[PDB]
Design a protein around this ligand. Sequence first.
Ligand code: NAG
Length: 246
Amino acid sequence: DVSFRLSGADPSSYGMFIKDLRNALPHTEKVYNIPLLLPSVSGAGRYLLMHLFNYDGNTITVAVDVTNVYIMGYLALTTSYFFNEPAADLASQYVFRSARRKITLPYSGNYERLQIAAGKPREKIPIGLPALDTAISTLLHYDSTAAAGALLVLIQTTAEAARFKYIEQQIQERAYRDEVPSSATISLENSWSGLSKQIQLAQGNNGVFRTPTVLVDSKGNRVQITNVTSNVVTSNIQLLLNTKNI
Ligand SMILES: *[C@@H]1O[C@H](CO)[C@@H](O)[C@H](O)[C@H]1NC(C)=O
C-alpha cells in the first residue's frame, strides 16, 4: 500500500508519495530506461491500495490497477464505490469486500464520461493539493455529480503525476494554490497510451517511433515527437503502458 496525508503536506511530501506510488508498481523490464508495466497480474495482486487522508485526517482508500495505473474504485468508511465498467466490476471481486454496501457509480472512469458527469472539461477544473484535499472530502459521502469532478482531480494528482514528471511538478507548483492544468498537462494525459506504444515500437526500429506523437509544449505550442531522444522520453515519462494492453 501507499499513503499520502494532506495535513502538513508540501512539495517534498507530495514528491515522496508520487515516488512511493511509482515504486509500488511492479515491472520486470525497462524500455529506454523507463519501467514497463506488466501485461497482466492475476488475482488481488493486480490492485494497489492508496490511502489518502484529507486535512482533517479523514480517509479513503483508492484501488489502482497496477498494469495501467487506472483507478477502479475506492472505499469511504463502510461503503465501497466502483466505476460502471467491466474492469472495475472485476476489481470489486478482490478489494473492499468487507464494505457493508457497494455502490456502482453511474459512469465509467474514462475522462470523456467523467467530464460529462461533472458538467465541465478537465481544462476548467483547478487541480493542486488543495483540490485534492477537497476531492477526498467530496468522496467521503456519496454525491455522484460532485464525485465525478473529485475523481477528475484525484486521477490527475495521483496516477497522471506518477506517469509524468512534468505533471508531478505541476502539482508541486500548486501545493498551496489550485490552478487548472496546463494544456501540456492535458496533452500528456491524452497521449500516455500512444507514447507508451511508440517507445516500445522504437525498440526494433533504432529508437524511431513508427508513428509520431503530437504534444503541446510548456509554451502552448504543438510539437511532433518522432524518436526516443525527445525530452518527453528521456526526462518526463516514468511508466509505460504495456503494448499487450493497447
Ligand atoms: C529525433 O528527435 C529530435 C527531437 O528531440 C529531433 O531533433 C530529430 O530531428 C529527430 N530525428 C529523427 C531521425 O527522427
